[PDB]
Amino acid sequence: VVGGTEAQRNSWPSQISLQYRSGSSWAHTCGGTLIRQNWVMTAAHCVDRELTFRVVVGEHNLNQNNGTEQYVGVQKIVVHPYWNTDDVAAGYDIALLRLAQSVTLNSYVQLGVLPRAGTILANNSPCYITGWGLTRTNGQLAQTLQQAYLPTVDYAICSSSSYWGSTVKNSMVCAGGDGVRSGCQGDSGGPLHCLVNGQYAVHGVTSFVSRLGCNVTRKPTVFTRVSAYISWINNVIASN
């Protein structure tokens, strides 16, 4: 997250870190949202590689013991069947991970609230992206979880010529684009939390930014629109 602030430890308890095994260690690669005690929602592109993945819940600082983390392997990966790695702009950038064990809920570990199917947010709706992604374009991952306030940019504006044009689809949510704040590599798969009727819900799964840079004016961060996939999500969890 570029132009973020450090999140308080208990603000976003559904945020997870998706990590891959690298030598004798683990490396953060993406975020995700815990949606059941044994299921995580993340981006399909995060799990394109044939890697060993683990999920960490109750994480705050990737480089220090927080005394709250739970570590669990990924037992099964279900990518949306229409996802195509060669075409992020087509959409369908979503995947569900079934965890090898069910994690224990507490003030640091909670399920993310998903919007009802079909919900669209009004333009300029208040949302926060969270994650450990790069803090600058071509920078480095954050140590501590960051949040940035990124109001939505509705489909009409986002798909206009000055913004993303036809690269953005109505199955996506755009947010930010101010040139200062944005998601960045390593935030992919994580949540966009939006305040609606007094309660934050996870409306987006971070998907992409401009090839030009993370914080680019009129290139808001783009997220898979969660509310476009509610049936798909329920279907997978029920059959797995």
């Binding site: 992020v88 702009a89 590599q185 971070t206 998907s207 992409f208 993370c214 961060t221």
Partner: peptide, 4 residues
């Protein structure tokens, strides 16, 4: 488009 850049996957992040």
């Amino acid at each position: 488009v850049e996957p992040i």
